[PDB]
Amino acid sequence: FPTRMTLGLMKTKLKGANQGYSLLKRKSEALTKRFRDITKRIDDAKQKMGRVMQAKEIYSRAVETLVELASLQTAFIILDEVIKVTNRRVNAIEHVIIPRTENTIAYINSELDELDREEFYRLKKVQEKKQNETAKLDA
Amino acid sequence: LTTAEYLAYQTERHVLTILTDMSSYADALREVSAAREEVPGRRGYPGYMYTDLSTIYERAGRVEGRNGSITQIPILTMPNDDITHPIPDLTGYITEGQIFVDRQLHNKGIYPPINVLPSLSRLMKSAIGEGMTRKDHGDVSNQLYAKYAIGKDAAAMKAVVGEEALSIEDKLSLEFLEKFEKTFITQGAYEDRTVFESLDQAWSLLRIYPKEMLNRISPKILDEFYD
């Protein structure tokens, strides 16, 4: 499990999750601004539609614009939900994925360093054994 | 091994050798090497183990003029469920192909947990095609591997992203993956199925995916079974 390749894949996934977190953050900001402008426009359209409510023809050119504003409103709501999902994804990319990847990378690094230390210790013991044998044969 | 050799070179019959708990044998060899105070390798294994392990893999193969065939099928347990270990690495590098067993699928409760990703066969080339099994064999095999890989990537995506299964393609890929996992992957321990039955089952399992969704299937293979 504790391999250098696995550490590389985890690190790459971590960096990708970081860049994705930044992108999702900026996207959440833009979506927030857009939903805000669409919200102000929704209020303005609410006042406009509330202006004349309760005759002759040409009424087909009236309710149409109100329908467009309604479409913009629904799109604004969907944008709000999507912004919520984006914020949730950003929150999941903050203290969840990042911490897990960091901890995993730390543990893997510790395991690899410890294994390398053990191998180096065994090699040092082998070299010491050979040196001792040579020193014994030299006499 | 000498018994199998004596069976192949004299009795002239089909022989199958199997070594159980080869990891214990490797540990024993490592112990013998450690007692000799020689230069230890990875996981305390011997330096000449490369020739030793090969000698364990040299118990297979047929001969010219001999009707009998000896094939060794050793079995070992990877330490700490890690195939990256020297034993499994050497066993995989020396021998052609390896059978891997996932612990998760075994923890699922389904039948035998073979992971098609790590699993491969180098003898599946000349043993495929018409005259052996079917002309739809290799194509459906490659298509199965591609579908499994796509399903795996779609699973990782499903883990990273939402539950919407990443639009269309990844959804069908994940569905086909789960279907192949609950059906094709598990045939049951007490059930023995032929190649034609597996081919038909795979043909029924590939009906979920579109005909143009398979890039691993040629024109003839796509026109092979429309039934």
Short mmCIF file of C-alpha atoms in Angstrom, two decimals:
data_model
loop_
_atom_site.label_atom_id
_atom_site.label_comp_id
_atom_site.label_asym_id
_atom_site.label_seq_id
_atom_site.Cartn_x
_atom_site.Cartn_y
_atom_site.Cartn_z
CA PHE A 1 0.00 0.00 0.00
CA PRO A 2 2.82 2.41 0.95
CA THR A 3 4.46 2.96 -2.44
CA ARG A 4 6.09 5.99 -4.06
CA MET A 5 3.73 5.65 -7.03
CA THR A 6 0.71 5.68 -4.72
CA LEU A 7 2.16 8.77 -3.03
CA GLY A 8 2.53 10.39 -6.44
CA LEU A 9 -1.04 9.57 -7.42
CA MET A 10 -2.32 10.87 -4.09
CA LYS A 11 -0.27 14.06 -4.43
CA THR A 12 -1.47 14.59 -8.00
CA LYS A 13 -5.07 14.02 -6.93
CA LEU A 14 -4.49 16.48 -4.08
CA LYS A 15 -3.12 19.19 -6.37
CA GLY A 16 -5.95 18.58 -8.82
CA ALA A 17 -8.44 18.84 -5.98
CA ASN A 18 -6.79 22.11 -4.95
CA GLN A 19 -6.99 23.64 -8.42
CA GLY A 20 -10.54 22.32 -8.68
CA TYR A 21 -11.29 23.93 -5.33
CA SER A 22 -10.00 27.29 -6.55
CA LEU A 23 -11.97 26.97 -9.79
CA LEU A 24 -15.12 25.99 -7.90
CA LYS A 25 -14.54 28.94 -5.57
CA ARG A 26 -14.23 31.48 -8.39
CA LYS A 27 -17.22 29.87 -10.11
CA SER A 28 -19.16 30.15 -6.85
CA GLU A 29 -18.24 33.84 -6.65
CA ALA A 30 -19.32 34.53 -10.23
CA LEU A 31 -22.51 32.54 -9.68
CA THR A 32 -23.13 34.53 -6.50
CA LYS A 33 -22.73 37.86 -8.30
CA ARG A 34 -24.90 36.68 -11.19
CA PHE A 35 -27.58 35.40 -8.82
CA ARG A 36 -27.41 38.70 -6.94
CA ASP A 37 -27.91 40.79 -10.08
CA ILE A 38 -30.66 38.39 -11.13
CA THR A 39 -32.16 38.83 -7.66
CA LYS A 40 -32.24 42.61 -7.94
CA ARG A 41 -33.68 42.15 -11.42
CA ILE A 42 -36.21 39.75 -9.90
CA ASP A 43 -37.28 42.41 -7.40
CA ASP A 44 -37.47 45.03 -10.14
CA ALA A 45 -39.52 42.63 -12.28
CA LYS A 46 -41.71 41.94 -9.25
CA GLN A 47 -42.42 45.64 -8.83
CA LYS A 48 -42.93 46.01 -12.58
CA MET A 49 -45.38 43.10 -12.74
CA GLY A 50 -47.02 44.43 -9.59
CA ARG A 51 -47.44 47.86 -11.16
CA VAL A 52 -50.33 46.89 -13.42
CA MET A 53 -52.31 43.87 -12.25
CA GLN A 54 -55.92 44.52 -11.22
CA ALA A 55 -59.30 47.32 -22.00
CA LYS A 56 -57.99 46.66 -25.52
CA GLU A 57 -55.71 44.43 -27.60
CA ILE A 58 -51.87 44.20 -27.69
CA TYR A 59 -51.82 42.48 -24.29
CA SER A 60 -49.79 39.70 -25.92
CA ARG A 61 -46.76 42.01 -25.92
CA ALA A 62 -47.18 42.63 -22.19
CA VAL A 63 -47.36 39.27 -20.41
CA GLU A 64 -44.58 38.01 -22.69
CA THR A 65 -41.92 40.23 -21.10
CA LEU A 66 -43.27 39.22 -17.69
CA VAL A 67 -42.90 35.59 -18.76
CA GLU A 68 -39.30 36.28 -19.76
CA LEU A 69 -38.68 37.91 -16.38
CA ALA A 70 -40.27 34.86 -14.75
CA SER A 71 -37.91 32.62 -16.71
CA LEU A 72 -35.02 34.77 -15.49
CA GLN A 73 -36.36 34.37 -11.95
CA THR A 74 -36.58 30.58 -12.16
CA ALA A 75 -33.11 30.57 -13.71
CA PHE A 76 -31.97 32.69 -10.76
CA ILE A 77 -33.43 30.17 -8.30
CA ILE A 78 -31.74 27.29 -10.12
CA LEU A 79 -28.57 29.40 -10.04
CA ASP A 80 -29.00 29.75 -6.28
CA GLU A 81 -29.36 25.99 -5.86
CA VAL A 82 -26.34 25.39 -8.10
CA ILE A 83 -24.42 27.98 -6.08
CA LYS A 84 -25.37 26.07 -2.94
CA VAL A 85 -24.12 22.82 -4.48
CA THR A 86 -20.91 24.61 -5.49
CA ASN A 87 -20.45 25.96 -1.97
CA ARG A 88 -21.01 22.46 -0.60
CA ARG A 89 -18.42 21.09 -3.02
CA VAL A 90 -16.01 23.82 -1.91
CA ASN A 91 -16.63 22.92 1.72
CA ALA A 92 -16.01 19.27 0.84
CA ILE A 93 -12.77 20.23 -0.90
CA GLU A 94 -11.60 22.21 2.13
CA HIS A 95 -11.63 20.29 5.42
CA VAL A 96 -12.53 16.88 3.99
CA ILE A 97 -10.59 15.86 0.88
CA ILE A 98 -7.58 18.09 1.59
CA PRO A 99 -7.19 16.86 5.19
CA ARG A 100 -7.63 13.21 4.19
CA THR A 101 -5.09 13.49 1.37
CA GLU A 102 -2.64 15.35 3.62
CA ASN A 103 -2.95 12.81 6.44
CA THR A 104 -2.65 9.89 4.02
CA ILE A 105 0.41 11.47 2.39
CA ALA A 106 1.94 12.04 5.83
CA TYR A 107 1.36 8.46 6.96
CA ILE A 108 2.64 7.08 3.66
CA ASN A 109 5.73 9.29 3.88
CA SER A 110 6.33 8.10 7.44
CA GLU A 111 5.95 4.45 6.41
CA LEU A 112 8.25 4.85 3.41
CA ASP A 113 10.88 6.73 5.43
CA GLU A 114 10.72 4.12 8.20
CA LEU A 115 11.02 1.26 5.71
CA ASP A 116 13.96 2.96 4.00
CA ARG A 117 15.52 3.51 7.43
CA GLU A 118 15.11 -0.17 8.27
CA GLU A 119 16.61 -1.23 4.94
CA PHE A 120 19.51 1.19 5.40
CA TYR A 121 20.00 -0.17 8.92
CA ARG A 122 20.11 -3.74 7.60
CA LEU A 123 22.58 -2.66 4.91
CA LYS A 124 24.72 -0.91 7.51
CA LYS A 125 24.63 -4.07 9.62
CA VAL A 126 25.69 -6.10 6.59
CA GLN A 127 28.55 -3.71 5.84
CA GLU A 128 29.57 -3.83 9.50
CA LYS A 129 29.48 -7.63 9.37
CA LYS A 130 31.66 -7.71 6.26
CA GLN A 131 34.06 -5.18 7.80
CA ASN A 132 34.22 -7.25 10.99
CA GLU A 133 34.88 -10.43 9.00
CA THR A 134 37.61 -8.68 7.02
CA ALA A 135 39.14 -7.28 10.21
CA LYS A 136 39.04 -10.79 11.69
CA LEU A 137 40.70 -12.32 8.63
CA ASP A 138 43.32 -9.56 8.54
CA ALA A 139 44.74 -10.73 11.87
CA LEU B 1 8.00 -30.61 -9.26
CA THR B 2 10.11 -33.69 -9.96
CA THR B 3 6.90 -35.72 -9.81
CA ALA B 4 5.31 -33.47 -12.44
CA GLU B 5 8.46 -33.68 -14.56
CA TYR B 6 8.42 -37.47 -14.26
CA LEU B 7 4.73 -37.41 -15.19
CA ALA B 8 5.29 -35.28 -18.29
CA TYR B 9 8.54 -36.81 -19.55
CA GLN B 10 7.58 -40.45 -18.94
CA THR B 11 3.89 -41.12 -18.27
CA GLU B 12 3.00 -38.64 -21.04
CA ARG B 13 -0.10 -37.11 -19.46
CA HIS B 14 -1.53 -33.69 -18.60
CA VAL B 15 -0.10 -32.53 -15.27
CA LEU B 16 -1.05 -29.54 -13.12
CA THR B 17 1.22 -28.44 -10.28
CA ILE B 18 0.02 -26.19 -7.46
CA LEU B 19 2.05 -24.66 -4.64
CA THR B 20 0.08 -23.59 -1.57
CA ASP B 21 1.29 -20.85 0.80
CA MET B 22 4.34 -20.01 -1.31
CA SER B 23 4.76 -16.93 0.89
CA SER B 24 5.75 -19.24 3.73
CA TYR B 25 8.27 -20.86 1.39
CA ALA B 26 9.69 -17.44 0.52
CA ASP B 27 9.87 -16.59 4.22
CA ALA B 28 11.64 -19.89 4.88
CA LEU B 29 14.12 -19.23 2.08
CA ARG B 30 14.64 -15.74 3.48
CA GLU B 31 15.27 -17.33 6.87
CA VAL B 32 17.83 -19.72 5.41
CA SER B 33 19.50 -16.78 3.66
CA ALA B 34 19.46 -14.77 6.89
CA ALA B 35 21.04 -17.65 8.80
CA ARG B 36 23.84 -17.68 6.22
CA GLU B 37 24.56 -14.03 7.06
CA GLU B 38 24.67 -13.21 3.34
CA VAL B 39 23.59 -10.02 1.58
CA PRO B 40 19.81 -9.64 2.08
CA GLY B 41 17.50 -8.23 -0.58
CA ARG B 42 14.03 -6.70 -0.41
CA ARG B 43 11.89 -8.01 2.47
CA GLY B 44 14.90 -10.03 3.63
CA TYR B 45 14.79 -12.17 0.49
CA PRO B 46 17.98 -13.76 -0.91
CA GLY B 47 19.97 -12.22 -3.76
CA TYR B 48 19.92 -15.41 -5.82
CA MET B 49 16.18 -15.74 -5.16
CA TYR B 50 15.60 -14.47 -8.71
CA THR B 51 17.08 -17.76 -9.90
CA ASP B 52 15.32 -19.62 -7.09
CA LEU B 53 11.86 -18.21 -7.83
CA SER B 54 12.49 -18.95 -11.50
CA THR B 55 13.20 -22.55 -10.52
CA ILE B 56 9.74 -22.59 -8.95
CA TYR B 57 8.35 -21.23 -12.21
CA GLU B 58 10.42 -23.67 -14.26
CA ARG B 59 8.16 -26.54 -13.22
CA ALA B 60 5.82 -25.76 -16.11
CA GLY B 61 5.96 -26.06 -19.89
CA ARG B 62 5.67 -28.94 -22.35
CA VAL B 63 8.21 -30.72 -24.55
CA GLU B 64 8.54 -31.58 -28.24
CA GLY B 65 7.26 -35.08 -28.96
CA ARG B 66 5.50 -35.36 -25.61
CA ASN B 67 1.71 -35.69 -25.59
CA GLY B 68 1.65 -34.74 -21.91
CA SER B 69 1.74 -31.20 -20.56
CA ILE B 70 2.98 -29.94 -17.20
CA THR B 71 1.69 -26.59 -15.95
CA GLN B 72 2.53 -25.16 -12.53
CA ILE B 73 -0.10 -23.00 -10.82
CA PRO B 74 1.47 -21.73 -7.56
CA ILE B 75 -0.51 -19.77 -4.96
CA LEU B 76 0.79 -17.28 -2.40
CA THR B 77 -0.53 -14.64 0.00
CA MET B 78 0.57 -11.04 -0.55
CA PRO B 79 1.84 -9.48 2.72
CA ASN B 80 -0.47 -6.85 4.26
CA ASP B 81 -2.76 -7.22 1.23
CA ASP B 82 -0.08 -5.54 -0.88
CA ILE B 83 0.77 -6.86 -4.34
CA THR B 84 3.65 -4.37 -4.39
CA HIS B 85 5.59 -6.78 -2.18
CA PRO B 86 8.78 -8.41 -3.58
CA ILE B 87 7.18 -11.87 -3.57
CA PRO B 88 4.13 -10.84 -5.64
CA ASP B 89 6.27 -8.51 -7.77
CA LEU B 90 8.74 -11.27 -8.67
CA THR B 91 5.94 -13.80 -9.16
CA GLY B 92 4.17 -11.38 -11.48
CA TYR B 93 7.28 -10.35 -13.41
CA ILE B 94 8.54 -13.90 -13.92
CA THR B 95 5.34 -15.80 -14.70
CA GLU B 96 3.00 -14.65 -17.47
CA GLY B 97 -0.10 -13.02 -16.01
CA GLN B 98 -1.39 -13.03 -12.44
CA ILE B 99 -4.69 -13.63 -10.65
CA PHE B 100 -5.50 -10.88 -8.15
CA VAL B 101 -8.18 -11.04 -5.46
CA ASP B 102 -9.76 -7.85 -4.12
CA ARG B 103 -10.67 -7.75 -0.42
CA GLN B 104 -13.57 -5.35 -0.95
CA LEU B 105 -15.48 -7.56 -3.39
CA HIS B 106 -14.81 -10.46 -1.02
CA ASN B 107 -16.27 -8.29 1.73
CA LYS B 108 -19.31 -7.62 -0.45
CA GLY B 109 -20.64 -11.14 0.07
CA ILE B 110 -20.70 -11.98 -3.63
CA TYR B 111 -18.84 -14.98 -5.06
CA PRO B 112 -15.10 -15.03 -5.90
CA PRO B 113 -13.52 -11.51 -5.99
CA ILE B 114 -11.22 -11.43 -9.02
CA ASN B 115 -10.12 -7.92 -10.02
CA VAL B 116 -10.00 -7.74 -13.81
CA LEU B 117 -7.81 -4.63 -13.68
CA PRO B 118 -4.75 -6.32 -12.11
CA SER B 119 -5.62 -9.70 -13.64
CA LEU B 120 -4.26 -10.58 -17.09
CA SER B 121 -3.29 -13.54 -19.27
CA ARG B 122 -0.56 -13.69 -21.91
CA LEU B 123 -1.82 -17.06 -23.13
CA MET B 124 -5.21 -15.58 -24.01
CA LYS B 125 -3.88 -14.54 -27.42
CA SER B 126 -3.29 -17.79 -29.31
CA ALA B 127 -6.05 -19.49 -27.32
CA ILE B 128 -8.63 -17.04 -28.66
CA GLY B 129 -10.19 -16.62 -32.10
CA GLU B 130 -12.02 -19.09 -34.32
CA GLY B 131 -11.07 -22.76 -34.07
CA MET B 132 -10.46 -22.54 -30.33
CA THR B 133 -13.44 -20.85 -28.69
CA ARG B 134 -15.01 -18.11 -30.82
CA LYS B 135 -14.07 -15.22 -33.11
CA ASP B 136 -15.99 -12.92 -30.76
CA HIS B 137 -13.71 -13.87 -27.87
CA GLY B 138 -10.85 -11.37 -27.97
CA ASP B 139 -13.09 -8.47 -28.98
CA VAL B 140 -15.56 -9.09 -26.15
CA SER B 141 -12.63 -9.52 -23.77
CA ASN B 142 -11.08 -6.17 -24.70
CA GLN B 143 -14.54 -4.59 -24.61
CA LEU B 144 -15.05 -6.08 -21.15
CA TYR B 145 -11.74 -4.67 -19.93
CA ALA B 146 -12.55 -1.26 -21.41
CA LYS B 147 -16.03 -1.30 -19.87
CA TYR B 148 -14.59 -2.31 -16.50
CA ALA B 149 -11.96 0.44 -16.61
CA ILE B 150 -14.51 3.03 -17.70
CA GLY B 151 -16.78 1.82 -14.91
CA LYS B 152 -13.94 2.17 -12.42
CA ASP B 153 -13.14 5.72 -13.51
CA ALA B 154 -16.87 6.46 -13.41
CA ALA B 155 -16.94 5.03 -9.89
CA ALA B 156 -14.09 7.28 -8.78
CA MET B 157 -15.90 10.17 -10.46
CA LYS B 158 -19.10 9.17 -8.66
CA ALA B 159 -17.11 9.32 -5.43
CA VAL B 160 -15.59 12.72 -6.19
CA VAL B 161 -18.66 14.22 -7.88
CA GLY B 162 -22.37 13.90 -7.11
CA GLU B 163 -24.74 10.95 -7.26
CA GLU B 164 -25.88 11.89 -10.77
CA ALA B 165 -23.25 9.47 -12.10
CA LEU B 166 -21.55 12.11 -14.27
CA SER B 167 -24.05 12.73 -17.09
CA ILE B 168 -24.80 9.87 -19.49
CA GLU B 169 -21.76 7.79 -20.47
CA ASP B 170 -20.44 7.35 -16.92
CA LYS B 171 -23.92 6.35 -15.74
CA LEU B 172 -24.23 3.55 -18.29
CA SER B 173 -20.61 2.60 -17.58
CA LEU B 174 -21.28 2.35 -13.84
CA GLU B 175 -24.52 0.45 -14.44
CA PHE B 176 -22.76 -2.02 -16.74
CA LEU B 177 -19.94 -2.30 -14.20
CA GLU B 178 -22.29 -3.14 -11.33
CA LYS B 179 -24.23 -5.50 -13.59
CA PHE B 180 -21.06 -7.32 -14.65
CA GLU B 181 -20.01 -7.39 -11.00
CA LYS B 182 -23.26 -8.93 -9.76
CA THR B 183 -23.52 -11.38 -12.66
CA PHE B 184 -20.41 -11.90 -14.80
CA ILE B 185 -17.98 -11.54 -11.89
CA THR B 186 -19.87 -14.01 -9.69
CA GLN B 187 -20.74 -17.30 -11.38
CA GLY B 188 -20.98 -19.15 -8.07
CA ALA B 189 -18.58 -21.70 -6.59
CA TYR B 190 -20.74 -24.76 -7.27
CA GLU B 191 -21.60 -23.70 -10.82
CA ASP B 192 -19.58 -24.67 -13.90
CA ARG B 193 -20.43 -22.66 -17.02
CA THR B 194 -19.21 -23.15 -20.59
CA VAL B 195 -17.62 -20.51 -22.82
CA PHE B 196 -20.75 -20.19 -24.96
CA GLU B 197 -22.92 -19.54 -21.90
CA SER B 198 -20.51 -16.85 -20.74
CA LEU B 199 -20.47 -15.38 -24.25
CA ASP B 200 -24.27 -15.25 -24.33
CA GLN B 201 -24.39 -13.79 -20.82
CA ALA B 202 -21.86 -11.16 -21.86
CA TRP B 203 -23.91 -10.49 -24.99
CA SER B 204 -26.95 -9.91 -22.78
CA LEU B 205 -24.90 -7.78 -20.38
CA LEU B 206 -23.57 -5.65 -23.25
CA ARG B 207 -27.10 -4.91 -24.44
CA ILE B 208 -27.36 -2.16 -21.82
CA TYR B 209 -24.64 -0.18 -23.59
CA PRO B 210 -25.13 1.26 -27.11
CA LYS B 211 -23.73 -0.47 -30.20
CA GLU B 212 -21.67 2.62 -31.03
CA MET B 213 -20.51 2.92 -27.42
CA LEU B 214 -17.93 0.17 -27.91
CA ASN B 215 -14.73 1.35 -29.59
CA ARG B 216 -12.97 -1.91 -28.74
CA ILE B 217 -15.29 -3.90 -31.00
CA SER B 218 -14.59 -4.10 -34.74
CA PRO B 219 -17.19 -3.94 -37.54
CA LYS B 220 -17.50 -7.73 -37.71
CA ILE B 221 -17.62 -8.08 -33.93
CA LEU B 222 -20.36 -5.44 -33.72
CA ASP B 223 -22.27 -7.32 -36.42
CA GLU B 224 -21.44 -10.66 -34.78
CA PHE B 225 -24.32 -11.07 -32.33
CA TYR B 226 -27.33 -8.83 -32.92
CA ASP B 227 -29.61 -11.61 -31.66
#
